Amino acid sequence: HHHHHHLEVLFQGPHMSGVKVRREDAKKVLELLKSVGILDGKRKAIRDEKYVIFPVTDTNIAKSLGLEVVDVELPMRPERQIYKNLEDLLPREIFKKLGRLDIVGDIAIVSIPDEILSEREVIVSAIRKLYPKVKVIARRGFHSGLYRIRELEVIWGENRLHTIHKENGVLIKVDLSKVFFNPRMKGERYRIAQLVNDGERILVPFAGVIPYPLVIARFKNVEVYAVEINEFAVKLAEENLELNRDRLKGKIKIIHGDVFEVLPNLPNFDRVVSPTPKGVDALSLTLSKAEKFLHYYDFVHESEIERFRERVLEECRRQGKECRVSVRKVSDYKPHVYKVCADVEILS
C-alpha cells in the first residue's frame, strides 16, 4: 500500500469550494490565500453587496486559516481574451477616473489620481492584459521645467523610461525621464508630411527628439531645420537621425539652441511647423520665419477659438502678410480645452 501523503494528490476532479469573506477583508484575504498557496487560479472570484468568494484548492488549510468554507459553482477563468478596451477590464468607477493611457514603445503611461491609487494592482493588471507586450507601466504626473519633462513613476515592470517607438515608418528613440514626447501627434505628423512638397525648406522649432522632421523627411525630399534647447533631446535626436538615415528621403539639420535666440539668425523658410510647448507664445517669431505656410500649434479654451483665429490674423497683418488662416481642433486636451493648429497660408 501507498503512503497517504502520496495518495492525497491523486484526485482528478475540479475544486468545488471557496472562502466567503467580507469585502473589507477581501484584499487582505486574497494576499493570505496567495501566500499560503491555496488560491485556485482556475476559477473566478465573485462578489455581492457584502461578500467576496475566493476559489481555494484546499478547504482544510482554509479552515486552519479561520476562513468560512462554502460550496459554490464559480466561473471558470477565461481561456480566450476578447477585451479590446481598458473599460472592458475595469469597474467603471475606476476606469472613469483614469487619465488617458498612452503607449510609447514598450512603455505604458497612465494617469492615476490619488483617490484610486488604492486600486493600483487591478489597474496594472488590466493594462498588462490589454497590452501583453509592454514591459513598463508608469504613472503620469505633470510637466516640469524648461524642457517640459513629464513627472513619471514606474509602477510596474523594468525600471527604465527609455525605449524605441515606431511611427509612420520611422524609429524614435525616447527617454521619457529626460525629454518630452507625445505619440498622439502621429496623425498630425503624417498629415503635414503629406502636405509638404519636394524641394521645400522647412523649419521645426521645439523639435524635441525630432519626430516631426523625421516623419516629414521620411515621406518627402526636403531640407528640415530642427531647433531644440534640451541637450538630452538633441542627443537623442542625433541618434534618431543616425538610426533612420537609410530610410529618409529628405535631409535634417539639428540645431541645439534657444528657439527665441536661434530663429532671428536663420534665413526664412517655405514652411514652418511649430509644435509649441503648452503656454508658450511663439506665434510672431515662427510666422516671421515662414514664407508660404505656418503650422502653429496651441492650446485654447473652446470659448476662445475665434479670438485665437483673430489674433493669428492680427499678427499676420502686423507683419504685413496677406494670409488665409484656418484653425483645426487637433485633439481634446481637457474638458472645454482643445489642442489646436493654426494653418496659415501666406498669399503672394
Curated annotation (Swiss-Prot):
Record InterPro entries: MeTrfase_TRM5/TYW2, SAM-dependent_MTases_sf, TRM5-TYW2-like_MTfase, TRM5/TYW2-like_N, Trm5a/b_N
Known EC number: 2.1.1.-, 2.1.1.228
Subcellular location: Cytoplasm
Binding site for S-adenosyl-L-methionine: R189, F206, E228, I229, D258, V259
Reaction catalysis annotation: guanosine(37) in tRNA + S-adenosyl-L-methionine = N(1)-methylguanosine(37) in tRNA + S-adenosyl-L-homocysteine + H(+); 4-demethylwyosine(37) in tRNA(Phe) + S-adenosyl-L-methionine = isowyosine(37) in tRNA(Phe) + S-adenosyl-L-homocysteine + H(+)
Any one of the GO BP annotations: tRNA N1-guanine methylation
CDD domains reported for this sequence: AdoMet_MTases
Mitochondrion keyword on record: no
Class of enzymatic activity (EC top level): transferase
SUPFAM superfamilies referenced in this protein's UniProt entry, alphabetically: S-adenosyl-L-methionine-dependent methyltransferases (SSF53335)
Keywords assigned: Cytoplasm, Methyltransferase, S-adenosyl-L-methionine, Transferase, tRNA processing
Cellular component GO terms, alphabetical: cytoplasm
Effect of R148A: Strong decrease in both activities
Role this protein plays: Catalyzes both the N1-methylation of guanosine and the C7-methylation of 4-demethylwyosine (imG-14) at position 37 in tRNA(Phe).
Alphabetized NCBIfam families for the sequence: tRNAMtaseTaw22
Note: Less efficient than Trm5b and appears to be selective for methylating tRNA(Phe).
Similarity comment text for this entry: Belongs to the class I-like SAM-binding methyltransferase superfamily. TRM5/TYW2 family.
The protein, known as: tRNA (guanine(37)-N(1))/4-demethylwyosine(37)-methyltransferase Taw22
Naturally occurring in which organism (per UniProt): Pyrococcus abyssi (strain GE5 / Orsay)
